[PDB]
Design a protein around this ligand. Sequence first.
Ligand SMILES: NC(=O)c1ccc[n+]([C@@H]2O[C@H](COP(=O)([O-])OP(=O)(O)OC[C@H]3O[C@@H](n4cnc5c(N)ncnc54)[C@H](O)[C@@H]3O)[C@@H](O)[C@H]2O)c1
Ligand SMILES: NC(=O)c1ccc[n+]([C@@H]2O[C@H](COP(=O)([O-])OP(=O)(O)OC[C@H]3O[C@@H](n4cnc5c(N)ncnc54)[C@H](O)[C@@H]3O)[C@@H](O)[C@H]2O)c1
Ligand SMILES: NC(=O)c1ccc[n+]([C@@H]2O[C@H](COP(=O)([O-])OP(=O)(O)OC[C@H]3O[C@@H](n4cnc5c(N)ncnc54)[C@H](O)[C@@H]3O)[C@@H](O)[C@H]2O)c1
Ligand SMILES: NC(=O)c1ccc[n+]([C@@H]2O[C@H](COP(=O)([O-])OP(=O)(O)OC[C@H]3O[C@@H](n4cnc5c(N)ncnc54)[C@H](O)[C@@H]3O)[C@@H](O)[C@H]2O)c1
Ligand SMILES: CN(Cc1cn(C)c2ccccc12)C(=O)/C=C/c1cnc2c(c1)CCC(=O)N2
Ligand SMILES: CN(Cc1cn(C)c2ccccc12)C(=O)/C=C/c1cnc2c(c1)CCC(=O)N2
Ligand SMILES: CN(Cc1cn(C)c2ccccc12)C(=O)/C=C/c1cnc2c(c1)CCC(=O)N2
Ligand SMILES: CN(Cc1cn(C)c2ccccc12)C(=O)/C=C/c1cnc2c(c1)CCC(=O)N2
Lengths: 258, 258, 258, 258
Amino acid sequence: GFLSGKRILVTGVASKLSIAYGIAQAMHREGAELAFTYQNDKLKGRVEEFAAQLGSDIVLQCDVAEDASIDTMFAELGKVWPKFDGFVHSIGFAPGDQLDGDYVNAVTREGFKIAHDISSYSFVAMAKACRSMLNPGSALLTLSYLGAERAIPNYNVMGLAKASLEANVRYMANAMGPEGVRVNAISAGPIRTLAASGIKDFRKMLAHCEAVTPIRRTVTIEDVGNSAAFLCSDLSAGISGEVVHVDGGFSIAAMNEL
Amino acid sequence: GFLSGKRILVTGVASKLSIAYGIAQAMHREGAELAFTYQNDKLKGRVEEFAAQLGSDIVLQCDVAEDASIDTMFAELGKVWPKFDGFVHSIGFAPGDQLDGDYVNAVTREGFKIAHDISSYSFVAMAKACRSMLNPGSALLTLSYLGAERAIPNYNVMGLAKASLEANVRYMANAMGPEGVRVNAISAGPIRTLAASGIKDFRKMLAHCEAVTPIRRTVTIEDVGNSAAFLCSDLSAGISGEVVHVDGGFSIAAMNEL
Amino acid sequence: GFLSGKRILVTGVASKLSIAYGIAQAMHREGAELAFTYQNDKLKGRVEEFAAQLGSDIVLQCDVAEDASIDTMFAELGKVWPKFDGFVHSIGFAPGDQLDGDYVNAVTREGFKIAHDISSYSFVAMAKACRSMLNPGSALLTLSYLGAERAIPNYNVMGLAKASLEANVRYMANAMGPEGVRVNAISAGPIRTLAASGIKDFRKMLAHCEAVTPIRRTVTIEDVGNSAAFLCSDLSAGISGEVVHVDGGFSIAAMNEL
Amino acid sequence: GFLSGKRILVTGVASKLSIAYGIAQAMHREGAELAFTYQNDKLKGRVEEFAAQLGSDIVLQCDVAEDASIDTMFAELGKVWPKFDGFVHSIGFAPGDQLDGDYVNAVTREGFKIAHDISSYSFVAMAKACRSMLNPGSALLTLSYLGAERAIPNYNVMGLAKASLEANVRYMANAMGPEGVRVNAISAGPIRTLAASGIKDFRKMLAHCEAVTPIRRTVTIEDVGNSAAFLCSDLSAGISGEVVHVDGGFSIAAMNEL
Ligand SMILES: NC(=O)c1ccc[n+]([C@@H]2O[C@H](COP(=O)([O-])OP(=O)(O)OC[C@H]3O[C@@H](n4cnc5c(N)ncnc54)[C@H](O)[C@@H]3O)[C@@H](O)[C@H]2O)c1
Ligand SMILES: NC(=O)c1ccc[n+]([C@@H]2O[C@H](COP(=O)([O-])OP(=O)(O)OC[C@H]3O[C@@H](n4cnc5c(N)ncnc54)[C@H](O)[C@@H]3O)[C@@H](O)[C@H]2O)c1
Ligand SMILES: NC(=O)c1ccc[n+]([C@@H]2O[C@H](COP(=O)([O-])OP(=O)(O)OC[C@H]3O[C@@H](n4cnc5c(N)ncnc54)[C@H](O)[C@@H]3O)[C@@H](O)[C@H]2O)c1
Ligand SMILES: NC(=O)c1ccc[n+]([C@@H]2O[C@H](COP(=O)([O-])OP(=O)(O)OC[C@H]3O[C@@H](n4cnc5c(N)ncnc54)[C@H](O)[C@@H]3O)[C@@H](O)[C@H]2O)c1
Ligand SMILES: CN(Cc1cn(C)c2ccccc12)C(=O)/C=C/c1cnc2c(c1)CCC(=O)N2
Ligand SMILES: CN(Cc1cn(C)c2ccccc12)C(=O)/C=C/c1cnc2c(c1)CCC(=O)N2
Ligand SMILES: CN(Cc1cn(C)c2ccccc12)C(=O)/C=C/c1cnc2c(c1)CCC(=O)N2
Ligand SMILES: CN(Cc1cn(C)c2ccccc12)C(=O)/C=C/c1cnc2c(c1)CCC(=O)N2
């Protein structure tokens, strides 16, 4: 496939509904050799089983909250991939409290802190830690959301961390381009996954999206997986520091509901 | 390839240096069945020879300045492709005079008029004319430039027409999404082709670009061809009304020259 | 007032509901000497009255579709103002057929051409014609709408003309900056004016803009007029080539309706 | 002045070169009653003097890193102003090590955390703390820099904090709009101030911004102060959640250097 010969680290898989899951399957379908991380004890099992199904037996622990855990992970991966071709960063978090109701009243200094640490800093931390291990031709990929560009009810502080993340995308691309690494993000339309069902009227929001989105449907993890597979391959050699909208054109339209 | 089973119309090929040429070769490499247009008597020969080399014998005349010529072209193509899957719009023009020196002094009402007619209107005119002929799953693709977003010395009125073109990209995507067509643009970094060497210090400009572009090199028609092949395939099903920057991250950085 | 000692030409005045009317009002209050233009005779008297009420008796015919009319107006203007400090471009048009229903079906080469010639080129057409008459410190201002950046139903080809107009703002600014002229635009939110009559369910639309705007009200020709006086006064000396949004924050939110 | 009858809290004043100083000046001239805060004692006296010169004797300590200090300041402020009309956030910080050289190598979890906590969260931290004290019609204003939107050498992690800050502007605006509060930011061009000392060849940089800016000069704390008085006065009533560029058009051009 267009990814044969590449070695890519996929973080973030948590269920077959996960975006990273759709991204893994698509990169494997195109021939990439895959590696995986899991956050904690609760997820190791799920991730080993999916990794097995996609031909991989590289399943390593990584909590991006901790610098030591990122370094350790890259040390283990190094025994198997002295070098590789990039990773998909598909991680995000904000303390429950942060994403519901009036933004000014919900946010707290801690909430803000954690949300940015886990969703934005964690992307350049992973890069820092594996930098020398990357081949020229490598590609870094993170996942963002429209909340970073416009204020969306309930997304609250996550919008601030996503904005920080896209800017990180730009500064990471400008810093690493000289050594041969590209860095981009996919701004995905809303998809019902684990990380969502626990907040607001996500179901009513999806109905609204399907209605006003130009392609008249919400996007799927297969859609994201395909663009992701592409952003992480040599077919996108001319793209870097870009935030690509894979939301069916939702964001480029206005007042369609009327 | 990821384009097998697709039928795509490629306009704009003029020499092996042409962007549309790099786009044609890449879509053929991925398995698309190709069709071609040529502007006038001067180019027919070149285009038939390239079309032959990429397995196509559909070479039709089309001057987007004329509504009758667009309709005729789509009538001929229809005898061979009752239906197809989209086209690449890779056409642009502004009267010589328009692209050199102070913008306010260069522009004229005619210049402005022609520049917008040929570079922006021509994209929705082609869509209008072949609309019913498009399969669901189809994709429209045009080519734009950073001049549309920022003022660039000498690009002058072309910047205004490109801006009009990207907005057309958005309105065409919002109008056609319901019937199953996506519409996007690639904003390409500068490449030395026919359409350029006749204006300003393009050679010195390219040197400047290679220096400050994150990937530290200017992009090639192969780079554009690959992203183009992608935007026009089912792998980008979640992308529509988007202007993708294939300029190596040039535009997302600032003051690198220092 | 912050506009004391400034001489400002104001186009577009057609009724007391006109944005150009709100603007004229604010600049007069801020102490500017005013001058007005009118498209045709039907408006001659109507506009002379508006002008008297604002300390002004300079009232000239000017149809922007003709270089000769623009030239002739500025020559008359030159009798009473050999030098002046800028002008307000408050002109937009597109044949009626153009603004209703599916954009792809409604648009025509002619409708596109007229929309771009009157809504966008006239702005630089005017700057061209009075360039040697502007004093250092002058400012030019035009009006745009969100349809330039987003695809909005029915706005159709005006969206393209507005995107062209916003780009004309940046190219004008870049070329005239060095001789001391700033150029900007105000992207106003929806306002009930003549030109806004008959396009769709404007009324319902206004009701939507009102429930979803951060400030929870639509903006007024007074809100716009104040930003406009600011933008053409030395107070904004550090602002050029910018599109300022005076829409109560409508464009920066998303999904407030849900 | 257009700011008569308004009560404005101004943070960030540290020397007469400070942007907050230029702003304070303009709002005083426009007739606003002022109040100032100071980070620590080293600045206590220095700031009280600045304040006397502006018709003000309200001068309070406030270190934004602490919720308790912010709360305590606003309680003191409350003794002389049970209600007020908004405040100016003119605070940015990032450990020195953070701002020099390759961004990926320079950045650290701690540097990132501090940069985001002081440069971005403090802005909403303040709004949270004085929310019930704001009158209808109030305005909040913060300062950002182009590094939020583009990757600029050495600005490094400040770029991420500024992108977070610009997004905080839109979420603040969206949540406080309904109770009559507008929130905006000014993205200022390069100015020689304390904080700007020691980062790179700032001097050479200033020389670049000057040759390439449309207005061909760098902006001043007076240029910024005037836009700031405008943005916090009812004159800008129709503007909320906007990032206004007061950089003489620098960001809207490209390749003027060539
Ligand atoms: N689902 C959507 O609609 C949507 C839309 C746009 C963007 N995104 C973004 O895409 C990414 C993937 O989201 P998803 O929908 O697949 O959610 P998900 O819950 O399925 O998975 C995201 C992962 O975050 C990981 N994570 C949290 N803290 C971690 C830590 N400290 N260390 C390591 N891993 C940690 C979890 O293990 C989890 O698998 C996120 O960055 C999210 O913000 C999601
Ligand atoms: N070359 C670059 O650096 C660059 C960068 C960004 C965007 N672009 C854009 O990409 C597209 C392709 O440009 P290129 O560099 O391949 O130039 P090119 O000269 O190689 O080809 C462009 C085509 O324009 C066609 N054309 C002009 N008028 C026409 C008409 N009336 N009817 C039909 N066809 C007509 C010509 O036949 C020509 O083949 C253009 O839209 C251009 O503005 C080029
Ligand atoms: N009203 C809104 O909702 C809104 C919002 C954003 C931007 N705008 C823009 O503001 C400007 C003013 O519009 P308005 O809403 O005040 O409507 P309006 O109809 O009151 O004023 C526009 C003016 O267009 C002028 N005009 C048309 N053709 C002309 C020509 N050929 N030569 C000279 N003048 C000509 C008319 O004389 C008229 O006074 C337009 O460019 C419009 O696109 C309007
Ligand atoms: N000067 C420029 O070139 C420029 C350009 C665009 C934006 N800005 C922004 O404008 C703002 C003002 O910067 P400046 O250039 O006037 O520099 P400055 O150093 O003169 O002022 C910034 C203020 O930061 C305050 N500060 C730092 N930590 C603080 C804390 N923990 N608690 C309370 N106050 C604290 C200091 O008291 C100081 O007065 C910053 O946010 C900066 O990022 C500056
Ligand atoms: C795009 N989405 C989904 C989404 C959430 N909200 C509020 C929306 C609103 C509109 C459209 C999409 C969304 C996301 O990025 C998920 C964010 C997220 C972060 N931390 C979380 C949770 C969700 C949940 C669990 C947790 O503890 N921490
Ligand atoms: C990006 N480019 C190349 C380019 C041109 N200038 C001025 C630049 C400046 C900087 C970077 C790229 C460019 C283009 O889109 C080509 C535009 C173009 C249009 N009409 C033309 C000519 C060139 C040429 C022949 C004609 O008659 N009509
Ligand atoms: C923002 N608006 C108002 C508006 C129009 N449509 C379609 C909207 C949709 C949504 C929100 C606002 C608007 C405008 O800029 C006016 C545009 C305009 C141009 N030429 C016209 C007419 C209107 C009308 C008369 C004519 O002949 N030529
Ligand atoms: C625009 N600027 C000035 C500036 C800085 N760099 C690196 C630039 C590069 C190009 C153009 C302008 C600038 C700023 O916003 C100031 C940022 C800043 C934050 N924390 C700091 C310091 C500076 C310094 C002192 C500290 O401890 N913490």
